[PDB]
Design a protein around this ligand. Structure first.
Ligand SMILES: Nc1ncnc2c1ncn2[C@@H]1O[C@H](COP(=O)(O)OP(=O)(O)O)[C@@H](O)[C@H]1O
Ligand code: BEF
Ligand SMILES: [Zn+2]
Ligand SMILES: [Zn+2]
Ligand SMILES: [Zn+2]
Ligand SMILES: [Zn+2]
Lengths: 151, 111, 355
C-alpha cells in the first residue's frame, strides 16, 4: 500500500507570472504525458485561471501530484515588503516546528497547519508573512475576526 | 619574490592551511619538485568542523555587507553566539570578516 | 559473534581488574562532599533534574561510604549564590549527613558556583584532622564557569601544601581549572577528573569514590592511634548518655573513663578516644589483602570436576565456563567469580585447602 502510493514528486510545477498560470516542467518527457491528456486542453504551457481546479485534481489521478512552491528569495519581480517580527516576540516551540515543516527546504510550501484552538495560529501566519517579505492577503470567516487580525 | 627563487636553490614553503597548493605556483612564478598535503592519522576525531547555514528559525544567515544592519541576521548570529557560550567550557573565539562589521553588529547586539 | 562480543567485552573489563597489587590505602579518611547547587543545575539532562538526581545519589553514596569505611568522617558543602554554605560538620554519624541532604532537596538551586569558596571552606573543616587521616574533597561540579573573589591558583597551591586530595565529577565537559586542581593535587595523576556520559555512569562514579584512595610512596604519615574497644551493657533503667544528654536504655561503656555512648563508631565525648568494635576494623581487611584475580582456563586442557567447587552448578557445556584460582587451583563458575570478588573477600578453595 505504501509502495503503491508513491509519486514522482517535483516533475510538474505550477508557476504564476503576471497573473498567468503556466504548468512548467523540469523535463521535456512530461509534455507527452500532459499535452496528450484528455482533460487538459524547462517547458510550460498556458492554462486558464479558472480551470486550475480541474488540472490540479486531474494531476492527482495521473500520478503527478503538482507542488506549489515559491522561491521568494529569488523572486524580484514582485515588490518586496520589509516587515519583521519585533524583538519583544517569543515564538513558542510548536510554532517553530509548524513553520519548519513549511520553510524546511527554503521555499514556501503551500499546505495546512493544524494547531489546537488558542495555540497561536495567528502568530504562525504573521511569522510566515514576516519571513516571506511580500504582499500578503488574509481571509477570515467573520468581520470581528478580521479586526482582531489587524490588532 | 623573483629574486628569492633565483638566489636560493632549495626553498620550503610550508603552512598548515595552504590550499589549493597549485594556485601559489600560478600566482608566484616558481616550480616545485613535489607538493602534497598530509592527512592526520588520529584515532578519535579531535575537531568537529561544522557549517551553519540558517538560524533556529530556519532563516538564512550571511555576512553580506549590504545587509549587515538586518534584524534577522544580527539576531540569528547573536543567538548562536549565546548558545555556544553556554556549552563552551573555557574559551570561545569569534572571527569577523571586517572590523567595521564587528563594530556595527556588536552595537546592535548591545541594543 | 554476538555472544563472543560479550565475552571479549568481559575479558576487556577483566583486564583492568587483572593488575591488583596490594597498594597501600588509607583506611582512615576525612572526606568533604562539595555539591553544586546553582542555576546550571536546573537543566533537564538528568531526569528529573541535576539537583534532584545528585542529591539522591549523594544519599546512597553516604550510606555506602560509611558502610565500607566505618572509621572515617564526612562533611557536606553546597555552592549557592556564589558562596559556600556548610550543611554538615565533619562527623562519623551517617544519619546527620543524610538528614542534611534531605533538607537540601527542597530548596531550589540558584546563583553562580565558586570553587574557591568551597575549597577554602574545605581547607578549614579539614584543618583539625589528625595527620594519619587522608584529607579528601569530592566535588560534584555541574557548571562550565566559576566566579570567585580571589586567585584560584593560590588556593590550589595551599591545598597541595596541606596534603589535601580533590576528586571532581563534572557534568557537561572538561574545565581547565578543575583539571589543574585535580592534577596538581594528586601528584600529577589525571585520572581523578571524571565526566559522566549518562545516568548509569554517574552511579558507578559515586560508587567508585567509596573505595579508599591509594597513598603515594613519598607521603609517609605512619603512626599508632590510641583506640578503644568498649563492652555493651544492658541496664534495666534508662540512663543519661554522655554525648547527647538524653535518656537511652542501652549504650556502650568507654574503657578509659566509663562514660557511656549511644552509637559507634564515635570518639568519646570525655577522653577524646576513638571507640570502635572488632567488626569495624574487619570490614577493611579486604583492602589490605585483595584477592588475586581469577584467570579464565583455556578449553585445551582438561578440567577437574563438571560442577562448581563452591555452588555445585553444572558447568554449561567453545569457551570453558570455568574460573580457577592459582593459590588453590579450583575451578569456579561465572556466577561465583562475581560474588567471591565483590561480596565475599576470601576464596573458598584456599580456606578449604589444608596447609
Ligand atoms: N507566542 C505568543 N505570545 C503571546 N501570546 C500568544 C502567543 N501565541 C499566541 N498567543 C495568544 O494566544 C491567543 C490566541 O491566539 P490566536 O492566534 O487567536 O489563536 P487561534 O487562532 O489558534 O485560535 C491570543 O491571546 C494571542 O495573543
Ligand atoms: F483556532 Be482558533 F480558536 F481561531
Ligand atoms: Zn547520646
Ligand atoms: Zn572515654
Ligand atoms: Zn559457582
Ligand atoms: Zn583459591
Amino acid at each position: 500500500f505504501i509502495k503503491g502510493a508513491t509519486i514522482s514528486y517535483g516533475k510538474v510545477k505550477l508557476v504564476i507570472k503576471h497573473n498567468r498560470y503556466f504548468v512548467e516542467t523540469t523535463q521535456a518527457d512530461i509534455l507527452q504525458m500532459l499535452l496528450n491528456d484528455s482533460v487538459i486542453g524547462v517547458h510550460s504551457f498556458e492554462i486558464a485561471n479558472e480551470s486550475v481546479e480541474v488540472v490540479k485534481k486531474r494531476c492527482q489521478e495521473i500520478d503527478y501530484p503538482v507542488l506549489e512552491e515559491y522561491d521568494f528569495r529569488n523572486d524580484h519581480r514582485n515588490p518586496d515588503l520589509d516587515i519583521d517580527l519585533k524583538p519583544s516576540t517569543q515564538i513558542r516551540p510548536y510554532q517553530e516546528k509548524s513553520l519548519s515543516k513549511m520553510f524546511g527546504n527554503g521555499r514556501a510550501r503551500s499546505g495546512i497547519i493544524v494547531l489546537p484552538c488558542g495555540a497561536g495560529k495567528t502568530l504562525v501566519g504573521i511569522t510566515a508573512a514576516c519571513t516571506i517579505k511580500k504582499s500578503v492577503i488574509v481571509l477570515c470567516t467573520s468581520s470581528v475576526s478580521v479586526m482582531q487580525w489587524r490588532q | 619574490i623573483k629574486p628569492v627563487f633565483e638566489r636560493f636553490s632549495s626553498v620550503i614553503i610550508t603552512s598548515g592551511t595552504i590550499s589549493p597548493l597549485d594556485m601559489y605556483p600560478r600566482m608566484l612564478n616558481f616550480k616545485t619538485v613535489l607538493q602534497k598535503s598530509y592527512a592526520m592519522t588520529l584515532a578519535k576525531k579531535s575537531f568537529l568542523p561544522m557549517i551553519i547555514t540558517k538560524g533556529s528559525d530556519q532563516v538564512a544567515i550571511s555576512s553580506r555587507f549590504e545587509i549587515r544592519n538586518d534584524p534577522s541576521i544580527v539576531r540569528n548570529y547573536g543567538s548562536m553566539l549565546v548558545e555556544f557560550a553556554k556549552i563552551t567550557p573555557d574559551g570561545m573565539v569569534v572571527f569577523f570578516p571586517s572590523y567595521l562589521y564587528m563594530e556595527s553588529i556588536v552595537s546592535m547586539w548591545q541594543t | 559473534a554476538s555472544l563472543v562480543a560479550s565475552i571479549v567485552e568481559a575479558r576487556k573489563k577483566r583486564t583492568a581488574k587483572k593488575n591488583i597489587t596490594p597498594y597501600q590505602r588509607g583506611i582512615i579518611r576525612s572526606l568533604i562532599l562539595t555539591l553544586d547547587c546553582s542555576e546550571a543545575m536546573l537543566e533537564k539532562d538528568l531526569r528529573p533534574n541535576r539537583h534532584a538526581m545528585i542529591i539522591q545519589y549523594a544519599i546512597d553514596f553516604v550510606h555506602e561510604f560509611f558502610d565500607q569505611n566505618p572509621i572515617s568522617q564526612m562533611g557536606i558543602i553546597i555552592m549557592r549564590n556564589g558562596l559556600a554554605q556548610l550543611v554538615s560538620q565533619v562527623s562519623g554519624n551517617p544519619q546527620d549527613h543524610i538528614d542534611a541532604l534531605k533538607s537540601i532537596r527542597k530548596q531550589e538551586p540558584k546563583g553562580n558556583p565558586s570553587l574557591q569558596n568551597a575549597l577554602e571552606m574545605a581547607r578549614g573543616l579539614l584543618l583539625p584532622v589528625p595527620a594519619h587521616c587522608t584529607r579528601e574533597v569530592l566535588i560534584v561540579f555541574g557548571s562550565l564557569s566559576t566566579t570567585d573573589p580571589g586567585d584560584i591558583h593560590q588556593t590550589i597551591d595551599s591545598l597541595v601544601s596541606e596534603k589535601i586530595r580533590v576528586k571532581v565529577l563534572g557534568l557537561s565537559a572538561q574545565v581547565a581549572i578543575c583539571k589543574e586542581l585535580c592534577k596538581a593535587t594528586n601528584y600529577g595523576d589525571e585520572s581523578f577528573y571524571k565526566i559522566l556520559l549518562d545516568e548509569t555512569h554517574l552511579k558507578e562514579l559515586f560508587n567508585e569514590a567509596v573505595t579508599p584512595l591509594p597513598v603515594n610512596k613519598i607521603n609517609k604519615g605512619f603512626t599508632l592511634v590510641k583506640m578503644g574497644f568498649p563492652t555493651r551493657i544492658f541496664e534495666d533503667t534508662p540512663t543519661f548518655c554522655s554525648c547527647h544528654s538524653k535518656l537511652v536504655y542501652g549504650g556502650y561503656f568507654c574503657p578509659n573513663c566509663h562514660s557511656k555512648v549511644c552509637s559507634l563508631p564515635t570518639v568519646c565525648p570525655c577522653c577524646d578516644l576513638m571507640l570502635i568494635l572488632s567488626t569495624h576494623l574487619a570490614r577493611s581487611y579486604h583492602h589490605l589483602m585483595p584477592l588475586k584475580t581469577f584467570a579464565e582456563v583455556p578449553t585445551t586442557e582438561k578440567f577437574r570436576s563438571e560442577d562448581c567447587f563452591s555452588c555445585q552448578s553444572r558447568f554449561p557445556i567453545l569457551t570453558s565456563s570455568r574460573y580457577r584460582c592459582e593459590d588453590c587451583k579450583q575451578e569456579f563458575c561465572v556466577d561465583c567469580d562475581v560474588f567471591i570478588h565483590e561480596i565475599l573477600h576470601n576464596c573458598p578453595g584456599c580456606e578449604s585447602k589444608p596447609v
